[PDB]
Amino acid sequence: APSRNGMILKPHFHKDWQRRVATWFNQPARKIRRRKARQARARRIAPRPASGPLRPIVRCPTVRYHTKVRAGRGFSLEELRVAGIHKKVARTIGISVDPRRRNKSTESLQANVQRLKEYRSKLVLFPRKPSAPKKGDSSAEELKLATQLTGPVMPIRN
Amino acid sequence: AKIKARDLRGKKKEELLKQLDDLKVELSQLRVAKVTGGAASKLSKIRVVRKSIARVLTVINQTQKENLRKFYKGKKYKPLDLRPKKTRAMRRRLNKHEESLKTKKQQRKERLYPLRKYAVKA
Amino acid sequence: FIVDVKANKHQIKQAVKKLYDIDVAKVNTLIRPDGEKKAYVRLAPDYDALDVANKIGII
Amino acid sequence: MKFNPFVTSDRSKNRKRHFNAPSHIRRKIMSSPLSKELRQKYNVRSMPIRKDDEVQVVRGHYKGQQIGKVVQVYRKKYVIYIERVQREKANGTTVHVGIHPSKVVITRLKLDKDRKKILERKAKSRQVGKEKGK
Amino acid sequence: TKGTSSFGKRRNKTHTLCRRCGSKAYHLQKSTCGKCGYPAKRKRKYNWSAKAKRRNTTGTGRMRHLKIVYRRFRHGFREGTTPKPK
Amino acid sequence: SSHKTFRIKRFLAKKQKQNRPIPQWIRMKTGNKIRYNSKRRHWRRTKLGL
Amino acid sequence: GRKRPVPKGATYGKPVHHGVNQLKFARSLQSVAEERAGRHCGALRVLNSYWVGEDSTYKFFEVILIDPFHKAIRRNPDTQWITKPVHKHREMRGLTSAGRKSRGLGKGHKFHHTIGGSRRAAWRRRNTLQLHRYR
Amino acid sequence: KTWRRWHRRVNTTQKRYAICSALAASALPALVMSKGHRIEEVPELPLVVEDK
RNA sequence: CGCGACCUCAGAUCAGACGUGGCGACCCGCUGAAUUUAAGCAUAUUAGUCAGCGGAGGAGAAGAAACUAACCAGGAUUCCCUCAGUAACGGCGAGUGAACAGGGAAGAGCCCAGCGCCGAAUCCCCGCCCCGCGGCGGGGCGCGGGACAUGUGGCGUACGGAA
RNA sequence: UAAGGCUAAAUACCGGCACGAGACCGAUAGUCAACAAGUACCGUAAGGGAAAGUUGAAAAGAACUUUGAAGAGAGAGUUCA
RNA sequence: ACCCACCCGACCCGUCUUGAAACACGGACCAAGGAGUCUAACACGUGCGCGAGUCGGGGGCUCGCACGAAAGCCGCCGUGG
RNA sequence: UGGAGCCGCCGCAGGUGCAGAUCUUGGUGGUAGUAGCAAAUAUUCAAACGAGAACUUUGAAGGCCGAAGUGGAGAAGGGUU
RNA sequence: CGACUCUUAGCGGUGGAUCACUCGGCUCGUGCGUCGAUGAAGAACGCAGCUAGCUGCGAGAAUUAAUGUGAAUUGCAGGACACAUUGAUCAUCGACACUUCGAACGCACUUGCGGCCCCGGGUUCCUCCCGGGGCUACGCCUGUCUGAGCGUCGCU
Ligand SMILES: [Mg+2]
Ligand SMILES: [Mg+2]
Ligand SMILES: [Mg+2]
Ligand SMILES: [Mg+2]
Ligand SMILES: [Mg+2]
Ligand SMILES: [Mg+2]
Ligand SMILES: [Mg+2]
Ligand SMILES: [Mg+2]
Ligand SMILES: [Mg+2]
Ligand SMILES: [Mg+2]
Ligand SMILES: [Mg+2]
Ligand SMILES: [Mg+2]
Ligand SMILES: [Mg+2]
Ligand SMILES: [Mg+2]
Ligand SMILES: [Mg+2]
Ligand SMILES: [Mg+2]
Ligand SMILES: [Mg+2]
Ligand SMILES: [Mg+2]
Ligand SMILES: [Mg+2]
Ligand SMILES: [Mg+2]
Ligand SMILES: [Mg+2]
Ligand SMILES: [Mg+2]
Ligand SMILES: [Mg+2]
Ligand SMILES: [Mg+2]
Ligand SMILES: [Mg+2]
Ligand SMILES: [Mg+2]
Ligand SMILES: [Mg+2]
Ligand SMILES: [Mg+2]
Ligand SMILES: [Mg+2]
Ligand SMILES: [Mg+2]
Ligand SMILES: [Mg+2]
Ligand SMILES: [Mg+2]
Ligand SMILES: [Mg+2]
Ligand SMILES: [Mg+2]
Ligand SMILES: [Mg+2]
Ligand SMILES: [Mg+2]
Ligand SMILES: [Mg+2]
Ligand SMILES: [Mg+2]
Ligand SMILES: [Mg+2]
Ligand SMILES: [Mg+2]
Ligand SMILES: [Zn+2]
Numbered sequence A: 001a002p003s004r005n006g007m008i009l010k011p012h013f014h015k016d017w018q019r020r021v022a023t024w025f026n027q028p029a030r031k032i033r034r035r036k037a038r039q040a041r042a043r044r045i046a047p048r049p050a051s052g053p054l055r056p057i058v059r060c061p062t063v064r065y066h067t068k069v070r071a072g073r074g075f076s077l078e079e080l081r082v083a084g085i086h087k088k089v090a091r092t093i094g095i096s097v098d099p100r101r102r103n104k105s106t107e108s109l110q111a112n113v114q115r116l117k118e119y120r121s122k123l124v125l126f127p128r129k130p131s132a133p134k135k136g137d138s139s140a141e142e143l144k145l146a147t148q149l150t151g152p153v154m155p156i157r158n
Numbered sequence B: 001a002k003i004k005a006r007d008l009r010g011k012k013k014e015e016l017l018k019q020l021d022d023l024k025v026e027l028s029q030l031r032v033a034k035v036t037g038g039a040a041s042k043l044s045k046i047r048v049v050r051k052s053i054a055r056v057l058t059v060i061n062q063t064q065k066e067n068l069r070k071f072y073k074g075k076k077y078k079p080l081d082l083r084p085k086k087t088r089a090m091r092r093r094l095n096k097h098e099e100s101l102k103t104k105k106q107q108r109k110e111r112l113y114p115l116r117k118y119a120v121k122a
Numbered sequence C: 001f002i003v004d005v006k007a008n009k010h011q012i013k014q015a016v017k018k019l020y021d022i023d024v025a026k027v028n029t030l031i032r033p034d035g036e037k038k039a040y041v042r043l044a045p046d047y048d049a050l051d052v053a054n055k056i057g058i059i
Numbered sequence D: 001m002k003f004n005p006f007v008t009s010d011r012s013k014n015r016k017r018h019f020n021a022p023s024h025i026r027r028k029i030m031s032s033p034l035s036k037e038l039r040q041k042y043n044v045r046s047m048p049i050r051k052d053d054e055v056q057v058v059r060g061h062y063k064g065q066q067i068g069k070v071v072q073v074y075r076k077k078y079v080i081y082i083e084r085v086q087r088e089k090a091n092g093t094t095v096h097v098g099i100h101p102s103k104v105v106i107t108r109l110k111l112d113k114d115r116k117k118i119l120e121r122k123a124k125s126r127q128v129g130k131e132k133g134k
Numbered sequence E: 001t002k003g004t005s006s007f008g009k010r011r012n013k014t015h016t017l018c019r020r021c022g023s024k025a026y027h028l029q030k031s032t033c034g035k036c037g038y039p040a041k042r043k044r045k046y047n048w049s050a051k052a053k054r055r056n057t058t059g060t061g062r063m064r065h066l067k068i069v070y071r072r073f074r075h076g077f078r079e080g081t082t083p084k085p086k
Numbered sequence F: 001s002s003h004k005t006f007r008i009k010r011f012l013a014k015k016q017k018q019n020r021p022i023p024q025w026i027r028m029k030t031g032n033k034i035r036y037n038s039k040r041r042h043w044r045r046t047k048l049g050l
Numbered sequence G: 001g002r003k004r005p006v007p008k009g010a011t012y013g014k015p016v017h018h019g020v021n022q023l024k025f026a027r028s029l030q031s032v033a034e035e036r037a038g039r040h041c042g043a044l045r046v047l048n049s050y051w052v053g054e055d056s057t058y059k060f061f062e063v064i065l066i067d068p069f070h071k072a073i074r075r076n077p078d079t080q081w082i083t084k085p086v087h088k089h090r091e092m093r094g095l096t097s098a099g100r101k102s103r104g105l106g107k108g109h110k111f112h113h114t115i116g117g118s119r120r121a122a123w124r125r126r127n128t129l130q131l132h133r134y135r
Numbered sequence H: 001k002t003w004r005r006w007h008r009r010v011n012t013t014q015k016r017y018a019i020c021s022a023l024a025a026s027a028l029p030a031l032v033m034s035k036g037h038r039i040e041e042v043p044e045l046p047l048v049v050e051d052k
Numbered sequence I: 001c002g003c004g005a006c007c008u009c010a011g012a013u014c015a016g017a018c019g020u021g022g023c024g025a026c027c028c029g030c031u032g033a034a035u036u037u038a039a040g041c042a043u044a045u046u047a048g049u050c051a052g053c054g055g056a057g058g059a060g061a062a063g064a065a066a067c068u069a070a071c072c073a074g075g076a077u078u079c080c081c082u083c084a085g086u087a088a089c090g091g092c093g094a095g096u097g098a099a100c101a102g103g104g105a106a107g108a109g110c111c112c113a114g115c116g117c118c119g120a121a122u123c124c125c126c127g128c129c130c131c132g133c134g135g136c137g138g139g140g141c142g143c144g145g146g147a148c149a150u151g152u153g154g155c156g157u158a159c160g161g162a163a
Numbered sequence J: 001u002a003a004g005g006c007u008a009a010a011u012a013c014c015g016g017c018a019c020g021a022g023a024c025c026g027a028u029a030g031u032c033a034a035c036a037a038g039u040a041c042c043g044u045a046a047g048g049g050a051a052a053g054u055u056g057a058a059a060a061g062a063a064c065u066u067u068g069a070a071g072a073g074a075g076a077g078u079u080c081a
Numbered sequence K: 001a002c003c004c005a006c007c008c009g010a011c012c013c014g015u016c017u018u019g020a021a022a023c024a025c026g027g028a029c030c031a032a033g034g035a036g037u038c039u040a041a042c043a044c045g046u047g048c049g050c051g052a053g054u055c056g057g058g059g060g061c062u063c064g065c066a067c068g069a070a071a072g073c074c075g076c077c078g079u080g081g
Numbered sequence L: 001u002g003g004a005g006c007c008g009c010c011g012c013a014g015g016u017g018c019a020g021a022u023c024u025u026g027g028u029g030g031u032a033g034u035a036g037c038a039a040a041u042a043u044u045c046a047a048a049c050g051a052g053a054a055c056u057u058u059g060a061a062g063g064c065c066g067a068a069g070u071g072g073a074g075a076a077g078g079g080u081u
Numbered sequence M: 001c002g003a004c005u006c007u008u009a010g011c012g013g014u015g016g017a018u019c020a021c022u023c024g025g026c027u028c029g030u031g032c033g034u035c036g037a038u039g040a041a042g043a044a045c046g047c048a049g050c051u052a053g054c055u056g057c058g059a060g061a062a063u064u065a066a067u068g069u070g071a072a073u074u075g076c077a078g079g080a081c082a083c084a085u086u087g088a089u090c091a092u093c094g095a096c097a098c099u100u101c102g103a104a105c106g107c108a109c110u111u112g113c114g115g116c117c118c119c120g121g122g123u124u125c126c127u128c129c130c131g132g133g134g135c136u137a138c139g140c141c142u143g144u145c146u147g148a149g150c151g152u153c154g155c156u
Helices: A027-044 A077-083 A087-093 A106-121 B013-035 B040-072 B104-112 C009-019 C049-056 D011-019 D023-029 D036-042 D113-133 E050-055 E066-075 F006-018 G029-040 G071-075 G097-101 G119-126 H012-024 H029-034
Strands: A021-023 A057-059 A069-071 A123-125 B118-120 C024-031 C037-043 D031-033 D046-048 D054-057 D068-074 D079-088 D094-099 D104-108 E015-017 E024-027 G048-054 G059-064 G129-131
Touching: A057 A106, A077 A087, A077 A106, A106 A123, B013 B040, C009 C024, C009 C037, D023 D031, D031 D104, D036 D104, D046 D113, D054 D079, D068 D094, G029 G048, G029 G059, G029 G097, G048 G097
Parallel strands: A021 G129
Antiparallel strands: A057 A069, A123 B118, C024 C037, D031 D046, D054 D068, D054 D104, D068 D079, D079 D094, E015 E024, G048 G059
């Protein structure tokens, strides 16, 4: 029964909720586990960025977010076509590619081509064998860095 | 007095049997003697003879089964006994050669578009 | 005797003959309330039971 | 402290480990120090005590400078019986009184081949650590 | 009569020893158990008797195969080999 | 009953073997907590798995 | 359809649940068809089914099955996914094309129930007091 | 129950304020002596040392 | 009144394989209450919850848009934080109740049928040799059987593809 | 771009094997269960289901004498007790 | 504070009840056990920090955690509330 | 008396204080050496053993069941009686 | 004073509170994440020199082999062993073994009845008889052999 003034309030504890309470005593143990697993994955992908692949710049949807810009899922095909990277290869050099992205405006396209161009400049493709063929960079830019890149690769700053 | 595994390994098959028989006889008499009092001195042996009997029988089965899996090592179909028991499910895994069969389409993919070792910022 | 519970009279007869080089008239088994199949074994009249009894140890 | 995160430091766990210990493990638990004399000679602090070592009892009632030969090792009872370490029961019969191995000192070892190789292994590890420390 | 005098004529039995579960619950006329359902291919268990469930779970018995499987696994399901001999 | 099956007879036999009282040398063992058998079944009171 | 198996009527309860006649099973007949083909041939691994006709009384179906342990399937790489033991009893778990449809999962606004794995899982997620450490 | 609110979370400035307060009174011989520490013969109370 | 193809069907203690039961904390598919709340009760609620049946795996399920949106647009699934006790449902009472966006954990994408081209270029089992053999495989050689044109294999699948 | 299909990862885990810890309980508590417990015992059956830890550092657990048919005592002795 | 004596006073507690010494119920006696808890949401009061802001989660970076499943830090410091 | 751990102060935390619940588990009284050991006719003498005899055994006498039996054998059930 | 009753204290009983211990629980976390026709889980019955229960094992039955260890096990016996030797005793466990029921499999649940191949006594393949051994569940797939049909054809 209500007594003199207060929010006529509806709690949702009518089902058997104590049967499905989910505690968080994991979380520290979890946080570590992720972190180990993270450091392992770095070490496996030895000079490759820990991050992942490079990802496009992309505007959010809706009037609300609109003004901001994130990393997207992957670079469109037009953006790869214009940059001149064969889509099947782009995956092999650490360039995210989605193929479901349309491309409406040319301002978002040329920006994302520029991204890939810049990436290709500051990328150090190792040759397949220690014996060096084409494409593969010099042993100078190799000895001076077989270095991983900490954090997201070429980060987007709005 | 002591019958060891050590020596029995080399011995001939007929020779192993006679030895087992002679222990089986010796076991009988002690069992007889346990009924009629006998003596603590006898009622030790009964445990000893039992284990020496086992030591004999064991050597025989090891020899018979070693020879057997020599005889089939090579043949495709072999007795279930001699086939390798791991775990029901584990005997239905894919074959070790069968699970690394690439489709020609997948092989071609690995040939044309291999993942490359690369780094960034230079 | 006390005998293994799985045994037929035929088997006992054959065992008694084999072990003690003897020869049987008839075997006559029962089961003790304890679990151990007992066996009364009549030896053929050429043989004396007390003589074999002395051979096997018992008396 | 102990930092190894697979050891235990848990009364109940250590005691259970102890009392329900298996013979070969008890051998190690039932160890006893060498006399300073032997400590000098072999380069070994202590040794697993055995059926017929010569031994002094250091503490208790039987604490004394006599050197009694070991009589038996009752690993179930965590104890060793020693030559003249005994007590007359009600009816005159002598009874070998138990002494715990660690409250005893080995003056003379019973050296077999294996005991010889053990002492060679312990002395070598001791001198490796002194070389590492230096 | 309903009571003590009628306890008098309990001369004959319903159940006997079931040969799967071992319980004295094999109903002779029905020729089924009512404990494991014997003739029934699958074992009888019900989720309401959690106490009953626990009374013959796995752990309970010998686990004579299953206890050496656990050991076998531990060290790695190695087969047909020995340790280096002397 | 005097008309037994073999199944039942064997069952009874084991039950008959289980009844015996403790061997007194057991009392003298090292870590002994056992003083009496406590699983002793008298036919006149308590009536079998049957 | 599916009449409610209760003696006479006698679905004792609140008269919401009094229904016995006009009510209808969740899975399709085609799924039931597969499930039965699966039941019967335990070794065989149900792949998929199709329709071949319908009377008033019956429907007919044709369930494609596969030996997971016939070398021609085992060694063909493109099929050897069915030989994996997660794909035991697809039809029983609601995993063939047919029995997928009852589960009520597809992308987009017309679903939401089944916005974890499945119907059950979303409910599970939605009715967990997540009780955090610090709150 | 397990889901008793065990952990207790504190505003960050407040945490810092406490840690400043403790530092500030790690000076003050009185507060150090009162906390029991026999600091009678020590040469200087915010006691700082060489970095060997 | 034969013999021979095939089709559809039987029988074999035929050769060689698999399936059956268990466990069930977690998982997938069905099935499915009533105490209870509403200060009575029938819709509602309890609840797609307990019990019931089925089937799994080390996880399962899901998953590469017949999606979101309506923006200057995002771009598989799962998970967390938020959205939000909100939009909505409801004897509009009791009560119930999501999603997108946004930020993170992770991050990976692919293959058929078809349409077409390629002497079925494909597969299984036999038998002889060399290696290898405690996850039955490689290589060779057999007018040695069979599957298959009522369609096997290579190329190829919407991000276009072929010539 | 539906009416065919495969796919690791972050996710779950009061069952299992093997460990680690605790501002928990300390034998009417904590698991039914610290012990020969799902035991004894009950019930035709489904099922129900206990009680029960502690001599001492060491058994050194009371030789011997004596009263009594004996259980029981009286002295003696062991033990720091 | 142990016992006894004497003068005066003085019905048995608990409880429901307008009213209990009640011919109202519960209570032979002693030991141990035994009932306003925790979570969530709201409101007001009070204490502290910061203040047109505040915030910490969730996540991440720093360790094999002995003490740590803590402590610290974050253009994430603010997606967001 | 006992024989191995325990307390003061400042803070924090709670499964924190019992006379009652026809409360729970265990124990103990008064009642009380009380009720009670009364269905179905019956016992007596001597001896033996024996620490010890109303009750055992043997002998003698007196009695009962009175072959629809208090006799002689099974079924079921018990499970070593 | 007498007996009895009441009260207090001493000592003794009854009873097992309290306190002190704890090889047990309860909770949180970590890693791994493995049963089965090659017979699972579960049940039964067995097995020790003296052993009933718990445990441990399976007719090789408180265990065999192997490897590691290196003198015990021990309630009492007895023993072994040369503990300068594969060597007691534990641990591990890769070899061997694993009675009967049980999905449970020749058919039945009496523990009853069988069939078919081979072996030893029995014969001198004479079938009997006895004993031993190996097969003999259902469903299903790939092939194989034997077939069936006024099913569709061809040739005769
Ligand atoms: Mg990331
Ligand atoms: Mg292809
Ligand atoms: Mg009776
Ligand atoms: Mg309703
Ligand atoms: Mg549809
Ligand atoms: Mg199953
Ligand atoms: Mg109501
Ligand atoms: Mg009401
Ligand atoms: Mg009502
Ligand atoms: Mg509902
Ligand atoms: Mg359920
Ligand atoms: Mg999956
Ligand atoms: Mg799709
Ligand atoms: Mg989405
Ligand atoms: Mg809000
Ligand atoms: Mg609802
Ligand atoms: Mg094609
Ligand atoms: Mg799938
Ligand atoms: Mg207790
Ligand atoms: Mg107690
Ligand atoms: Mg308790
Ligand atoms: Mg106590
Ligand atoms: Mg006590
Ligand atoms: Mg006590
Ligand atoms: Mg004392
Ligand atoms: Mg009232
Ligand atoms: Mg009134
Ligand atoms: Mg009153
Ligand atoms: Mg009145
Ligand atoms: Mg009342
Ligand atoms: Mg009363
Ligand atoms: Mg109290
Ligand atoms: Mg306030
Ligand atoms: Mg003490
Ligand atoms: Mg507490
Ligand atoms: Mg009280
Ligand atoms: Mg009287
Ligand atoms: Mg008679
Ligand atoms: Mg008194
Ligand atoms: Mg008690
Ligand atoms: Zn049963």
